[PDB]
Amino acid sequence: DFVVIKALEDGVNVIGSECLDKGEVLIAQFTEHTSAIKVRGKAYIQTSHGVIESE
Amino acid sequence: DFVVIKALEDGVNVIGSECLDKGEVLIAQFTEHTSAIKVRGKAYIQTSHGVIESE
Amino acid sequence: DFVVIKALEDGVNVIGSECLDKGEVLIAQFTEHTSAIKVRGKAYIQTSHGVIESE
Amino acid sequence: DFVVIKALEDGVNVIGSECLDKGEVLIAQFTEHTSAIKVRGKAYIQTSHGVIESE
Amino acid sequence: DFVVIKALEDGVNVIGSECLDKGEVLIAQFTEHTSAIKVRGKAYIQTSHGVIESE
Amino acid sequence: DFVVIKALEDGVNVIGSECLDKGEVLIAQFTEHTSAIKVRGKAYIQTSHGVIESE
Amino acid sequence: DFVVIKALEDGVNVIGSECLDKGEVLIAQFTEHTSAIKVRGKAYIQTSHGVIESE
Amino acid sequence: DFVVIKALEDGVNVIGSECLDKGEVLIAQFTEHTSAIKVRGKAYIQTSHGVIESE
Amino acid sequence: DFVVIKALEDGVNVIGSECLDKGEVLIAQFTEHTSAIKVRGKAYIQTSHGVIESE
Amino acid sequence: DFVVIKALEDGVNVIGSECLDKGEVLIAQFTEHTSAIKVRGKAYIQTSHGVIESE
Amino acid sequence: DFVVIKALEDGVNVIGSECLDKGEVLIAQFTEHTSAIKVRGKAYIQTSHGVIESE
Amino acid sequence: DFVVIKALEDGVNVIGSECLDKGEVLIAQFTEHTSAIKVRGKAYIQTSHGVIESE
Amino acid sequence: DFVVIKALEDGVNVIGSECLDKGEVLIAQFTEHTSAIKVRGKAYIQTSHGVIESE
Amino acid sequence: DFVVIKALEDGVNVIGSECLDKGEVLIAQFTEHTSAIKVRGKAYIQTSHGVIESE
Amino acid sequence: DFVVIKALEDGVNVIGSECLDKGEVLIAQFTEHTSAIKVRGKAYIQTSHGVIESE
Amino acid sequence: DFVVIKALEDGVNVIGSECLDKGEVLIAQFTEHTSAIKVRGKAYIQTSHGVIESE
Amino acid sequence: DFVVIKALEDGVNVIGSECLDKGEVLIAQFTEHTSAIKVRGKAYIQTSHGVIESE
Amino acid sequence: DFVVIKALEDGVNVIGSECLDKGEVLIAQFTEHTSAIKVRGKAYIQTSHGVIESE
Amino acid sequence: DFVVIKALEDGVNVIGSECLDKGEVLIAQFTEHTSAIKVRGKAYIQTSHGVIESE
Amino acid sequence: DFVVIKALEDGVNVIGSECLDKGEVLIAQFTEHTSAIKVRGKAYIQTSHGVIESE
Ligand SMILES: [Au+]
Ligand SMILES: [Au+]
Ligand SMILES: [Au+]
Ligand SMILES: [Au+]
Ligand SMILES: [Au+]
Ligand SMILES: [Au+]
Ligand SMILES: [Au+]
Ligand SMILES: [Au+]
Ligand SMILES: [Au+]
Incomplete structure (x- = not known):
């Protein structure tokens, strides 16, 4: 239901x-409105499916 | 309920x-409207069923 | 609730x-309408029950 | 909630x-109407309970 | 919610x-009406509790 | 929600x-009415809690 | 939701x-009325929590 | 939802x-009324959290 | 939903x-009213999260 | 749904x-009102996510 | 449903x-209002997905 | 108005x-409903008319 | 008000x-309906007036 | 109209x-409700018909 | 209709x-309310059925 | 229906x-109100059940 | 308004x-109902008027 | 109007x-409801009439 | 009407x-609500009846 | 009805x-609202019960 984004560099955008x-570190839950989350820049994401590293 | 798409190359389309x-990295939840998601180009997808690599 | 179809060859039909x-890669959820999904051609399917390879 | 039938030979009937x-490969969900599914011929079925091979 | 019956011999009755x-192979779900299933003859049954072999 | 009774001998009663x-083999679900099931004779029962052998 | 009592000796009471x-073997479900079950005599009980042996 | 109390000695009280x-052996479910259960004397209790031995 | 408190010494208070x-041994469920439970003295508590020893 | 706080030193505040x-040892459930719990001083907390040691 | 934040340094902000x-240590549940939590400074977070260390 | 039945062996039925x-020992009074009492098995009965020994 | 019939042989009829x-052993009270009792076969009867032996 | 039960051993049940x-010593009268009294364990009963010794 | 209890020792309870x-010496009649009388301690009881000695 | 109390010493109380x-000598009948009679001191009581000597 | 009764021996009655x-030690206040208090046996009473020793 | 009870030993009951x-130390005032206070165990009581020592 | 509690050690509770x-030093008056005051830990209490030292 | 607090050091709080x-020197009477008075710091208090020295 929620994701964990650790911003490894400055100016990481979350849309x-x-x-x-x-x-x-931003812990974000999915509302009715927020149905999609886009991550720019270097960040380290933990979801239920595992971890990933956006650049 | 949601998928994680890391775009490994530029111009990856998500329909x-x-x-x-x-x-x-786009984290996408399934709404009532979005009942199917098509991914073009080289991308790395994590779902509940595991990971996969679209090309 | 959803299946993941990676089309390993061109012209893979999903009915x-x-x-x-x-x-x-098409990630497809089951609606009320879509109660059955038929896959033609060479494709690699991940469901909750595991993986399979249609030809 | 759904079964996966890979038809290993031609003319496999699903009732x-x-x-x-x-x-x-047919991925079939159970509706209210479809309360029983019969499979003829040589096919490879994956359910929640495991796999089986109809002949 | 459903059982899988592979008929290992001819004339297997399912009541x-x-x-x-x-x-x-018959994959049978339990409706409101079908509250009990009797299997005659030689058959191989997979349920949630495991497998069994009716004779 | 359901039990599986394989009758290992003739005349096994299910009340x-x-x-x-x-x-x-009788696969029996619990209705509102059937709140208790008694098994006589030699039979092999599979429930959710495991297996047992009535005599 | 239900217990399995194998009576290892005669005259086992279930209250x-x-x-x-x-x-x-008695397979007993809990109704609204039956909120407590007492077992006398030598019997072998399987519940969700495991097995036990009343004497 | 329920506990299993095997009375290892005579006169075990359950409140x-x-x-x-x-x-x-008493198998006790929690009603709306019974919100707390006190056990005196030497008894062997199995709950969902494991086993314990009251004295 | 419930905790198990074995009082290892006399006069253990449960608030x-x-x-x-x-x-x-007291097995206590959480009602609407009882939203917090305080344990004094030497006692051995089993919860869903594991065991602990109050002093 | 609930946390377990063992106060390892005197005067541990729970807000x-x-x-x-x-x-x-305080076992605290989350109500509608109590949506956040702050722990001061030296204490040992068990949650669903594991254990931790506040100082 | 809830996160555990151990503040490893002074002045850790939680938004x-x-x-x-x-x-x-702050144990925070997600309400309807609190749909996103941002953590500044050096802190140690435990969620359902695992642990992480904000700086 | 009442009878006294001492069951000298196990499984004595009283209808x-x-x-x-x-x-x-069962002491049974005659209601309006219970107008006849049948005793099976080995038992020792005391009535107003004297004693008797059912087998 | 009542009689005691011990059936000394099989098939003893009571009308x-x-x-x-x-x-x-049948202990029979006199209702309004049952105003006469006939005993066939070999039986041993105790009434208020004493004992008797039907053949 | 009443019975006298002297409990010669501990834990004698009266139903x-x-x-x-x-x-x-329990002196019990027959109400409208209490139309049958069952005695377990070792006890010494005095009724109008005489004395008896339950075991 | 009434019992006679001579208390042979101090603190004899009558319930x-x-x-x-x-x-x-307490002479007690049976009312509608008092349908059962329990005697603790050493006492000497006279009823219609005879005498008895509670301990 | 009535008791006879001969007071063998002074100050004998009858409650x-x-x-x-x-x-x-007091001859006392049982009314609706007087449902229990307690005798203190040294007295000699005659009831229907016989005689007794209170002290 | 109140008296203090220390029972120096067992079975001290307060009426x-x-x-x-x-x-x-019983501390008793005078209600509207309790307008007189009688003390039997050996006890030590403190009132407003001083102390006294009932025997 | 109030009493002071210092509990000199554990488990002192106040009724x-x-x-x-x-x-x-419990300082107890007399309400309308609390018209009598009974103290068990070893305790030291101060009232208006002086001090006393319950055992 | 009021008590004076000087807390001689830390963490003295007043209930x-x-x-x-x-x-x-806490000076506490008795309201309608506060009808009883319990003091834990080492404290020095002055009431109208004198002084006392809770531990 | 009133207390006298002489503040022997600066910053003495009265709650x-x-x-x-x-x-x-603060002379404070008890209103309906002010039902409890807490004194911090070094102060010298005179009440009806005597004097005391808060620190
Ligand atoms: Au583009
Ligand atoms: Au076909
Ligand atoms: Au039986
Ligand atoms: Au206690
Ligand atoms: Au701050
Ligand atoms: Au008992
Ligand atoms: Au007198
Ligand atoms: Au007494
Ligand atoms: Au505190």
Whole structure:
């Protein structure tokens, strides 16, 4: 139901817009509105399906 | 309930239309409307059933 | 609730009609209408029960 | 909730009537109407309980 | 919710009446009406609790 | 929700009354009415909790 | 939701009253009324939590 | 939803009042009323969390 | 949904007030009212998360 | 749905306010009101996600 | 449904605003309102997906 | 107005149905409904007319 | 008000119809309907007036 | 109209449920409800018809 | 219709609660309410059926 | 229906309160109100069940 | 308005009925109903007027 | 109007029920409901009339 | 009408809940609600009846 | 009805909040609202029960 995004670099954008600096962690749940989440920049994502590394 | 698409190359299309560049990651939930998702180009998909690599 | 079809060859048909080219991946959920899905051609399917290879 | 039938030979019948050729794969969900599914001929079935081989 | 009966010999009866020949496989779900299923003859049954061999 | 009774000998009674011969298999679901099932004679029962052998 | 009692000796009482002879097996579901089950005598009980041996 | 109490000694009290003799087994479900169960004396309890031995 | 408290010493208090002597075991479910349970004295608690030893 | 806090030192505060002494254990469920719990001082917490040690 | 944040350094901010000092632990559930939680500073987070370390 | 039945052996039936084990004693009064009492097995009966020994 | 019939042989009839086997004992009260009781076969009767032996 | 039960051993049950310890004496009258009284364990009963010793 | 209890020792309890000292005698009639009388301690009871000695 | 109390010593109390001196005799009937009679001191009681000597 | 009764021996009666054992202390206030208090046995009473020793 | 009870030993009961451990002090006022207070165990009581020591 | 509690040690609890540190003094009046006050830990209490020292 | 607090040091808090400097004296009466008064810091209190020294 929720994802965990650790921003490994500054200015990481999360759309669905929010900006994160280096070292912050955003835990985001899916609402009715937020049905899709796009991640730019270098970040480390943990979902239910496992982990992944956006660049 | 949701899929994770890491676009390994530029111009990856996701239909159900959105375009992704290299290194971005789209986490997509299934709405009532979006009942099917088609992925073109080279991308790395994680679902509940496991991982797969579209080309 | 959903299946993952990676089309390993061109012109793979999915009925319930859609056509896929080589390398694309279709993630399909079951609606009320779509109660049966038929797959032609060479494709690689992941379901909840495991994987299978249609030819 | 659904079964996966890979038709290993031509003319495989699925009742509940549909016909499959060799190499096709039918993913069938149970509706209210379809409460029983009979499979003739040589086919390879995956259910939640495991796999089986009809002849 | 459903059982898988592979008829290992001809004339296998399934009550709740249907008849199966050798090599066929019947996947049967429980409705409101079908609250009990009786199997005669030599057959190989897979349920959620495991497998069994009726004779 | 359901039990599987393989009658290992003739005349096995199932109350909640039905009679089974040797080699038959009865798959019984619990209705609102059938809240208790008594098994006489030599039979082999599979439930969710495991297997047991009535005599 | 249900328990399995194999009566290992004659006259096993089950309260919530029923009597069992040696070798019988009673599969009992919990209704709204039957909220507690007491077992006397030598019997072998399988529940969801495991097995136990009343004496 | 339910607990299993094997009374290892005579006069075991179960409050929420009932008395058990040595060798009996009480399987108790939680109603709306019975929201707490106290066990005195030497008894052997199986719950969902595991086993324990009251004295 | 419920906790198991074995009182290893006399006068163990359970608030949410009840008192237990040495060797007793209280199995407590959470109602709407009882939303917090405090345990004093030496006791051995089993929850869903595991075991713990209050002093 | 609930957390287990063993207060390893005196005066441990739990906000959402309650105070605990050394050796006590508070098992706290989440109501509608209590949507966040803050723990001060040296305490040992067990949740569903595992254990942790507040200082 | 809930996350566990151990603040490893002083002044850790949790948005969705609260401030934590070193050694405190905040257990936060997701309401309807709190649909996203941002964590600044050095903290140690446990979720259902595992652990992570914000900086 | 009442009879006294000492069950000298196990499984003594009293109709008007109840079962008694060895050593138990049932004191039964005549209601409007219970106008006849039948005793099977080995038992020792005391009535107003004297004593008798059913076998 | 009541009689005690010990059936000393099989098939003893009691009219007012019931059948008794050897060793059974029937204690019969007089209703408004049952104003006369006829006993066939070998039986041993105790009434208020004493004992008698029907053949 | 009433019976006298001297409990010669501990835990004597009287159904119609009450428990007696060794040396206690229960004098029980027959109500409209209590139309049958069953005595377990070792006890010494005095009725109008005489005395008896349950075991 | 009534019983006579001579309390041979102090603190004799009569339930149905009253307390008697040594040497007192309680003559108790059965009301509609008092349908059962339990006697603890050492006492000497005279009923219509005879005498008895509770301990 | 009535008891006879000869007061063998002064100050004998009869509750259900009356006081008797030495040598007096009280013949007491049971009303609806007086359902229990307690006798203190040294007295000699005659009932229907026989005689007794309170002290 | 209130009295203090320390029961120096067992079975001390307080009427207005209650029983006390040795070492207990009853602090009794005067209601509208309790307008007189009688104390039997050996006890030590403190009132507003001073102390006294009942025997 | 109020009493002061210092519990000199563990498990001191105060009826009118509360339990106290060693070293605690309960200051109790008389309500309309609490018209009598009984103290068990070893405790030290101060009233308006002076002090006393329950055992 | 009021009591004076000087907390001689840290964490002194006053129920009727409040916590006091060493050296603080709480002057508490009795409301309608607060009809009983329990004091834990080492504290020095002055009432109208005198002084006392809880531990 | 009233207390006298001489603040022997600066910043003495009186809750029920007011602050006092060194040498000031606050005479406080109990209203309906102010039912409890807490004193921090070094102060010298005179009540009806005597004097005390908060620290
Ligand atoms: Au594009
Ligand atoms: Au065909
Ligand atoms: Au039986
Ligand atoms: Au206690
Ligand atoms: Au801050
Ligand atoms: Au008992
Ligand atoms: Au008198
Ligand atoms: Au007493
Ligand atoms: Au505290």
